[PDB]
Tab-separated table of C-alpha atoms and ligand atoms in Angstrom:
chain	number	residue	atom	x	y	z
H	16	UNK	CA	-36.976	23.338	3.677
H	17	UNK	CA	-33.768	21.583	2.332
H	18	UNK	CA	-31.568	24.364	2.967
H	19	UNK	CA	-32.065	24.692	6.729
H	20	UNK	CA	-29.509	23.960	9.118
H	21	UNK	CA	-28.740	24.602	12.835
H	22	UNK	CA	-25.879	25.160	14.423
H	23	UNK	CA	-24.780	25.473	17.928
H	24	UNK	CA	-21.828	24.626	20.476
H	25	UNK	CA	-21.950	22.434	23.345
H	26	UNK	CA	-19.454	21.590	26.487
H	27	UNK	CA	-17.854	18.540	27.371
H	28	UNK	CA	-14.396	18.010	29.208
H	29	UNK	CA	-13.263	21.375	29.208
H	30	UNK	CA	-13.870	21.441	25.558
H	31	UNK	CA	-16.593	22.938	22.909
H	32	UNK	CA	-18.284	20.897	20.311
H	33	UNK	CA	-19.770	22.687	17.453
H	34	UNK	CA	-22.940	20.844	16.456
H	35	UNK	CA	-24.726	21.525	13.093
H	36	UNK	CA	-27.836	19.849	12.064
H	37	UNK	CA	-29.595	19.559	8.840
H	38	UNK	CA	-33.224	20.020	9.772
H	39	UNK	CA	-35.470	18.213	7.396
H	40	UNK	CA	-32.937	15.075	7.822
H	41	UNK	CA	-31.432	14.874	11.429
H	42	UNK	CA	-28.371	14.466	9.688
H	43	UNK	CA	-25.373	15.913	11.788
H	44	UNK	CA	-21.795	17.456	11.595
H	45	UNK	CA	-19.634	18.315	14.266
H	46	UNK	CA	-16.095	19.307	14.817
H	47	UNK	CA	-14.196	19.566	18.598
H	48	UNK	CA	-12.703	23.467	18.236
H	49	UNK	CA	-10.292	25.143	20.247
H	50	UNK	CA	-12.317	27.919	21.143
H	51	UNK	CA	-15.842	29.232	21.175
H	52	UNK	CA	-15.010	32.009	18.716
H	53	UNK	CA	-16.361	33.947	15.707
H	54	UNK	CA	-13.544	33.017	13.683
H	55	UNK	CA	-14.082	28.693	14.655
H	56	UNK	CA	-17.857	29.499	13.944
H	57	UNK	CA	-16.805	31.450	10.374
H	58	UNK	CA	-14.580	28.522	8.926
H	59	UNK	CA	-17.124	26.004	9.939
H	60	UNK	CA	-19.561	27.866	7.926
H	61	UNK	CA	-17.556	28.188	4.994
H	62	UNK	CA	-16.857	24.467	4.976
H	63	UNK	CA	-19.942	23.080	5.347
H	64	UNK	CA	-21.480	25.553	2.705
H	65	UNK	CA	-18.994	24.454	0.238
H	66	UNK	CA	-20.269	20.768	0.935
H	67	UNK	CA	-24.183	21.028	1.323
H	68	UNK	CA	-26.385	23.615	-0.250
H	69	UNK	CA	-26.761	26.001	2.901
H	70	UNK	CA	-29.402	28.557	2.574
H	71	UNK	CA	-30.531	29.347	5.787
H	72	UNK	CA	-28.884	28.778	9.467
H	73	UNK	CA	-30.800	29.198	12.693
H	74	UNK	CA	-29.217	28.777	16.177
H	75	UNK	CA	-30.100	28.830	19.765
H	76	UNK	CA	-27.578	31.678	20.728
H	77	UNK	CA	-27.916	34.548	18.269
H	78	UNK	CA	-25.126	36.096	19.532
H	79	UNK	CA	-22.814	33.364	18.043
H	80	UNK	CA	-23.344	35.320	14.866
H	81	UNK	CA	-22.600	39.003	15.382
H	82	UNK	CA	-19.037	38.846	14.806
H	83	UNK	CA	-17.582	40.292	11.245
H	84	UNK	CA	-16.070	37.547	10.626
H	85	UNK	CA	-19.239	35.065	10.897
H	86	UNK	CA	-21.149	38.021	8.722
H	87	UNK	CA	-18.134	37.978	6.191
H	88	UNK	CA	-18.425	34.004	5.869
H	89	UNK	CA	-22.159	34.380	5.688
H	90	UNK	CA	-21.900	36.886	2.768
H	91	UNK	CA	-19.373	35.485	0.948
H	92	UNK	CA	-21.276	32.041	0.829
H	93	UNK	CA	-24.604	33.583	0.352
H	94	UNK	CA	-26.132	32.190	3.613
H	95	UNK	CA	-28.773	34.204	5.595
H	96	UNK	CA	-29.703	33.776	9.451
H	97	UNK	CA	-33.050	31.924	9.441
H	98	UNK	CA	-35.977	33.651	11.395
H	99	UNK	CA	-38.237	31.069	12.196
H	100	UNK	CA	-37.418	22.478	17.725
H	101	UNK	CA	-38.121	19.081	18.387
H	102	UNK	CA	-35.602	17.445	16.275
H	103	UNK	CA	-32.429	19.472	17.229
H	104	UNK	CA	-32.939	18.866	20.612
H	105	UNK	CA	-33.097	15.254	20.151
H	106	UNK	CA	-29.965	15.246	18.215
H	107	UNK	CA	-27.962	17.016	20.602
H	108	UNK	CA	-28.466	14.759	23.825
H	109	UNK	CA	-28.569	11.595	21.098
H	110	UNK	CA	-25.089	13.041	20.299
H	111	UNK	CA	-23.891	13.312	23.986
H	112	UNK	CA	-25.414	9.994	24.599
H	113	UNK	CA	-23.756	8.149	21.566
H	114	UNK	CA	-20.236	10.297	22.959
H	115	UNK	CA	-20.532	8.709	26.139
H	116	UNK	CA	-21.151	5.340	24.973
H	117	UNK	CA	-17.976	5.032	22.496
H	118	UNK	CA	-15.938	7.604	24.590
H	119	UNK	CA	-13.598	4.550	25.616
H	120	UNK	CA	-13.183	3.611	22.289
H	121	UNK	CA	-10.538	6.704	21.560
H	122	UNK	CA	-7.968	8.257	23.646
H	123	UNK	CA	-9.328	12.007	22.597
H	124	UNK	CA	-12.572	13.204	22.845
H	125	UNK	CA	-12.019	14.823	19.406
H	126	UNK	CA	-12.248	11.290	17.803
H	127	UNK	CA	-15.121	10.122	20.079
H	128	UNK	CA	-17.253	13.005	18.296
H	129	UNK	CA	-16.903	11.799	15.128
H	130	UNK	CA	-17.471	8.074	15.868
H	131	UNK	CA	-20.705	9.100	17.302
H	132	UNK	CA	-21.283	11.325	14.287
H	133	UNK	CA	-20.667	8.313	12.204
H	134	UNK	CA	-23.000	6.349	14.393
H	135	UNK	CA	-25.819	8.767	14.534
H	136	UNK	CA	-25.765	9.462	10.488
H	137	UNK	CA	-25.859	5.674	9.715
H	138	UNK	CA	-28.595	4.978	12.185
H	139	UNK	CA	-31.650	3.263	10.673
H	140	UNK	CA	-34.391	4.752	12.566
H	141	UNK	CA	-37.644	2.629	11.467
H	142	UNK	CA	-36.945	3.229	8.454
H	143	UNK	CA	-33.908	4.873	6.785
H	144	UNK	CA	-30.692	6.758	8.170
H	145	UNK	CA	-30.476	10.546	8.239
H	146	UNK	CA	-27.174	10.018	6.060
H	147	UNK	CA	-29.759	8.390	3.795
H	148	UNK	CA	-32.514	11.072	4.132
H	149	UNK	CA	-30.554	14.180	3.484
H	150	UNK	CA	-29.081	12.520	0.213
H	151	UNK	CA	-32.736	11.565	-0.826
H	152	UNK	CA	-33.818	15.013	0.080
H	153	UNK	CA	-31.105	16.681	-1.543
H	154	UNK	CA	-31.232	14.779	-4.783
H	155	UNK	CA	-35.033	15.014	-5.018
H	156	UNK	CA	-34.607	18.790	-4.317
H	157	UNK	CA	-31.908	19.013	-7.269
H	158	UNK	CA	-34.195	17.859	-9.885
H	159	UNK	CA	-36.859	20.424	-9.775
K	20	UNK	CA	-18.226	2.675	-7.672
K	21	UNK	CA	-20.059	5.173	-5.394
K	22	UNK	CA	-17.916	4.298	-2.201
K	23	UNK	CA	-14.195	5.005	-3.763
K	24	UNK	CA	-12.760	8.130	-2.641
K	25	UNK	CA	-9.082	9.470	-3.714
K	26	UNK	CA	-6.720	10.886	-0.638
K	27	UNK	CA	-3.394	12.807	-1.065
K	28	UNK	CA	-1.823	15.730	0.273
K	29	UNK	CA	-0.192	18.586	-1.309
K	30	UNK	CA	1.921	21.694	-0.228
K	31	UNK	CA	1.348	25.519	-0.701
K	32	UNK	CA	2.890	28.512	1.462
K	33	UNK	CA	4.640	25.947	3.891
K	34	UNK	CA	1.274	24.191	5.059
K	35	UNK	CA	-0.127	21.145	3.778
K	36	UNK	CA	-3.569	20.429	2.087
K	37	UNK	CA	-5.405	17.322	2.590
K	38	UNK	CA	-7.571	16.497	-0.464
K	39	UNK	CA	-9.919	13.882	-0.663
K	40	UNK	CA	-11.825	13.420	-4.011
K	41	UNK	CA	-14.973	11.129	-4.934
K	42	UNK	CA	-13.813	9.176	-7.801
K	43	UNK	CA	-17.437	8.810	-9.461
K	44	UNK	CA	-18.401	12.579	-9.311
K	45	UNK	CA	-15.168	15.120	-9.016
K	46	UNK	CA	-16.476	16.358	-5.618
K	47	UNK	CA	-14.134	17.202	-3.022
K	48	UNK	CA	-13.323	17.605	0.503
K	49	UNK	CA	-10.332	19.339	1.930
K	50	UNK	CA	-8.732	20.473	5.119
K	51	UNK	CA	-5.555	22.462	5.845
K	52	UNK	CA	-3.606	20.302	8.094
K	53	UNK	CA	-1.072	21.668	10.686
K	54	UNK	CA	1.108	18.353	9.757
K	55	UNK	CA	1.297	15.775	7.328
K	56	UNK	CA	0.741	13.017	9.916
K	57	UNK	CA	-0.797	9.719	10.453
K	58	UNK	CA	-2.960	11.392	13.289
K	59	UNK	CA	-4.177	13.947	10.928
K	60	UNK	CA	-4.849	11.478	8.122
K	61	UNK	CA	-6.898	9.270	10.549
K	62	UNK	CA	-8.939	11.821	11.942
K	63	UNK	CA	-9.823	13.131	8.262
K	64	UNK	CA	-10.747	9.614	7.445
K	65	UNK	CA	-13.138	9.107	10.472
K	66	UNK	CA	-14.557	12.510	9.737
K	67	UNK	CA	-15.367	11.700	6.140
K	68	UNK	CA	-16.755	8.170	6.535
K	69	UNK	CA	-19.340	9.348	8.912
K	70	UNK	CA	-20.445	12.114	6.421
K	71	UNK	CA	-20.305	9.898	2.983
K	72	UNK	CA	-20.571	5.986	2.688
K	73	UNK	CA	-16.900	5.266	2.369
K	74	UNK	CA	-15.818	1.921	1.562
K	75	UNK	CA	-12.665	2.333	-0.288
K	76	UNK	CA	-9.661	4.655	-0.311
K	77	UNK	CA	-6.916	4.933	-2.997
K	78	UNK	CA	-3.687	7.382	-2.796
K	79	UNK	CA	-0.807	7.968	-4.796
K	80	UNK	CA	1.497	7.911	-1.916
K	81	UNK	CA	0.692	4.394	0.039
K	82	UNK	CA	3.285	5.158	2.627
K	83	UNK	CA	0.448	7.570	3.938
K	84	UNK	CA	-1.443	4.720	5.286
K	85	UNK	CA	0.762	2.548	6.893
K	86	UNK	CA	0.943	4.216	10.715
K	87	UNK	CA	-0.885	2.284	13.464
K	88	UNK	CA	-3.228	5.237	13.378
K	89	UNK	CA	-4.674	5.721	10.016
K	90	UNK	CA	-5.049	1.217	9.880
K	91	UNK	CA	-6.876	1.903	13.510
K	92	UNK	CA	-9.552	4.785	11.606
K	93	UNK	CA	-10.072	2.213	8.658
K	94	UNK	CA	-10.368	-0.715	11.194
K	95	UNK	CA	-13.268	1.149	13.082
K	96	UNK	CA	-14.984	2.937	10.078
K	97	UNK	CA	-14.682	-0.305	7.919
K	98	UNK	CA	-12.576	1.141	5.491
K	99	UNK	CA	-10.174	-1.166	2.719
K	100	UNK	CA	-7.261	0.266	0.785
K	101	UNK	CA	-8.416	0.536	-3.193
K	102	UNK	CA	-6.033	-1.613	-5.057
K	103	UNK	CA	-6.970	-0.547	-8.868
K	104	UNK	CA	-6.885	8.484	-12.960
K	105	UNK	CA	-7.766	11.379	-15.108
K	106	UNK	CA	-10.448	12.793	-12.848
K	107	UNK	CA	-7.984	13.188	-9.687
K	108	UNK	CA	-5.016	14.775	-11.525
K	109	UNK	CA	-7.650	17.056	-12.983
K	110	UNK	CA	-8.888	18.029	-9.547
K	111	UNK	CA	-5.997	18.506	-7.770
K	112	UNK	CA	-4.327	21.213	-9.898
K	113	UNK	CA	-7.857	22.972	-10.744
K	114	UNK	CA	-7.907	23.062	-7.061
K	115	UNK	CA	-4.602	24.748	-6.880
K	116	UNK	CA	-6.147	27.193	-9.911
K	117	UNK	CA	-9.250	28.204	-7.636
K	118	UNK	CA	-7.111	28.447	-4.686
K	119	UNK	CA	-4.672	30.993	-6.617
K	120	UNK	CA	-7.811	32.828	-7.856
K	121	UNK	CA	-9.440	33.464	-4.547
K	122	UNK	CA	-6.361	33.890	-2.801
K	123	UNK	CA	-6.526	37.482	-2.356
K	124	UNK	CA	-10.418	37.123	-1.168
K	125	UNK	CA	-9.363	36.188	2.459
K	126	UNK	CA	-6.210	36.586	4.812
K	127	UNK	CA	-5.573	33.102	5.278
K	128	UNK	CA	-4.750	30.228	3.282
K	129	UNK	CA	-7.238	27.697	4.789
K	130	UNK	CA	-9.909	30.123	4.379
K	131	UNK	CA	-9.164	30.327	0.637
K	132	UNK	CA	-9.035	26.686	0.459
K	133	UNK	CA	-12.423	26.333	1.716
K	134	UNK	CA	-13.952	29.216	-0.810
K	135	UNK	CA	-12.035	26.871	-3.525
K	136	UNK	CA	-13.722	23.826	-2.195
K	137	UNK	CA	-17.215	25.670	-2.602
K	138	UNK	CA	-16.332	26.919	-6.000
K	139	UNK	CA	-15.243	23.456	-7.389
K	140	UNK	CA	-18.272	21.764	-5.956
K	141	UNK	CA	-20.438	24.043	-7.019
K	142	UNK	CA	-19.233	24.667	-10.664
K	143	UNK	CA	-21.758	23.371	-13.495
K	144	UNK	CA	-19.875	21.348	-15.962
K	145	UNK	CA	-21.630	21.429	-19.204
K	146	UNK	CA	-23.962	19.767	-17.223
K	147	UNK	CA	-24.446	19.544	-13.238
K	148	UNK	CA	-21.730	20.319	-10.657
K	149	UNK	CA	-19.789	17.681	-8.396
K	150	UNK	CA	-21.929	18.366	-5.763
K	151	UNK	CA	-24.998	17.579	-7.885
K	152	UNK	CA	-23.102	14.321	-9.034
K	153	UNK	CA	-22.139	12.972	-5.851
K	154	UNK	CA	-26.178	13.175	-4.272
K	155	UNK	CA	-27.508	11.957	-7.107
K	156	UNK	CA	-24.759	8.974	-7.469
K	157	UNK	CA	-25.668	8.260	-3.853
K	158	UNK	CA	-29.207	8.536	-3.605
K	159	UNK	CA	-29.404	6.214	-6.705
K	160	UNK	CA	-27.055	3.831	-4.956
K	161	UNK	CA	-29.127	3.888	-1.802
K	162	UNK	CA	-32.378	2.868	-3.646
K	163	UNK	CA	-31.160	-0.610	-4.791
C	17	LIG	C1	-12.777	-0.120	20.146
C	17	LIG	C2	-11.538	-0.617	20.835
C	17	LIG	C3	-10.470	0.295	20.716
C	17	LIG	C4	-9.991	1.229	19.850
C	17	LIG	AS1	-8.398	1.927	20.092
C	17	LIG	C5	-8.215	2.708	21.699
C	17	LIG	C6	-7.118	3.641	21.928
C	17	LIG	C7	-7.074	4.180	23.066
C	17	LIG	C8	-8.140	4.010	24.198
C	17	LIG	C9	-9.192	2.905	23.929
C	17	LIG	C10	-9.240	2.346	22.696
C	17	LIG	C11	-8.638	3.884	18.871
C	17	LIG	C12	-8.099	3.605	17.508
C	17	LIG	C13	-8.210	4.903	16.687
C	17	LIG	C14	-8.548	6.004	17.168
C	17	LIG	C15	-8.972	6.003	18.773
C	17	LIG	C16	-8.824	4.966	19.400
C	17	LIG	C17	-7.440	1.012	18.871
C	17	LIG	C18	-7.725	-0.570	19.378
C	17	LIG	C19	-6.818	-1.532	18.723
C	17	LIG	C20	-5.922	-1.071	17.730
C	17	LIG	C21	-5.355	0.215	17.521
C	17	LIG	C22	-6.321	1.170	17.929
C	17	LIG	C23	-11.281	1.842	19.375
C	17	LIG	C24	-12.387	0.873	19.426
C	18	LIG	C1	-12.977	35.670	5.453
C	18	LIG	C2	-11.762	35.824	4.868
C	18	LIG	C3	-11.823	37.011	3.728
C	18	LIG	C4	-12.675	37.596	4.012
C	18	LIG	AS1	-12.699	39.698	2.956
C	18	LIG	C5	-10.810	40.124	3.116
C	18	LIG	C6	-10.227	39.938	1.665
C	18	LIG	C7	-8.717	40.265	1.615
C	18	LIG	C8	-7.838	40.199	3.007
C	18	LIG	C9	-8.251	39.834	4.099
C	18	LIG	C10	-9.954	39.860	4.185
C	18	LIG	C11	-13.742	40.721	3.787
C	18	LIG	C12	-14.450	41.734	2.699
C	18	LIG	C13	-15.337	42.647	3.438
C	18	LIG	C14	-16.016	42.594	4.852
C	18	LIG	C15	-15.427	41.578	5.781
C	18	LIG	C16	-14.633	40.461	5.237
C	18	LIG	C17	-13.124	39.396	1.176
C	18	LIG	C18	-12.956	40.535	0.517
C	18	LIG	C19	-13.372	40.897	-0.622
C	18	LIG	C20	-13.761	39.465	-1.646
C	18	LIG	C21	-13.905	38.259	-0.648
C	18	LIG	C22	-13.699	38.611	0.846
C	18	LIG	C23	-14.121	37.917	5.052
C	18	LIG	C24	-13.931	36.665	5.406
C	19	LIG	CL1	-7.707	9.124	19.717
C	20	LIG	CL1	-9.323	34.567	7.276
């Protein structure tokens, strides 16, 4: 299902990392956020939905989606919560693994996170990359 | 040329808006940044290059790309500066136009910017939208 995304937060170095995964492809979008709050979640959701066709979002922490600010962002962008596993578990530990490997390539964690996203999305696995798969899935979906 | 992006900053309400446009499609990515600095430009460049295949970036303010931090981000991500107009002028005023129209739909400007990106990218112009065009262009490019 091409419009389904998974969104969670993880923690590293006293900071919070919001990680979104496009389920059908394994492509990730991530941001280091200053605090685990509804405001940050809502702003990220609105940003993502303007960049990719987001129809439903799943999470492993349902409480992350209860705040008025998150519900208003889902309302405006027309997102609904996905009510129904292997891919997502493998992308987050793999993201932390890649972060660990490039941590010394930047001063700040936020920089290393985006180096990790870049490596993850371009890594051919075979054997296309997640980046190649999301664009194929969406482009195929557009054309009927 | 599918890997070319244009990046500039604009100003509204005492704030700075970084606007990136994928030249061949008119798709936009934008962020309200706290300051017009090399650090913010570099972080945005690294983020963008992990999400789309960025080969060259053009700007209407060449000085925006001279800081060690921006050059290091371009080095790491393998981006080069594009050395060689209608589309970009039409997207920024159009973004400010859409922002003006939704400004009262959110408290903060940063929220309205991302509502404006969302509307812009989904607007069918015919007659596909910029979002549809970038995915078609990239997916076509991948497959030879
Ligand atoms: C490999 C080696 C060095 C960096 As550099 C850097 C800065 C502090 C500690 C360790 C590495 C870097 C550039 C941009 C953003 C984050 C880190 C770096 C290396 C050479 C010239 C400029 C910057 C990246 C990859
Ligand atoms: C993010 C930014 C704005 C809203 As609204 C609102 C509009 C004007 C000033 C302040 C907030 C909102 C409406 C209803 C319930 C919750 C939030 C909003 C109102 C009307 C149209 C679009 C958005 C929601 C989420
Ligand atoms: Cl850094
Ligand atoms: Cl707001």
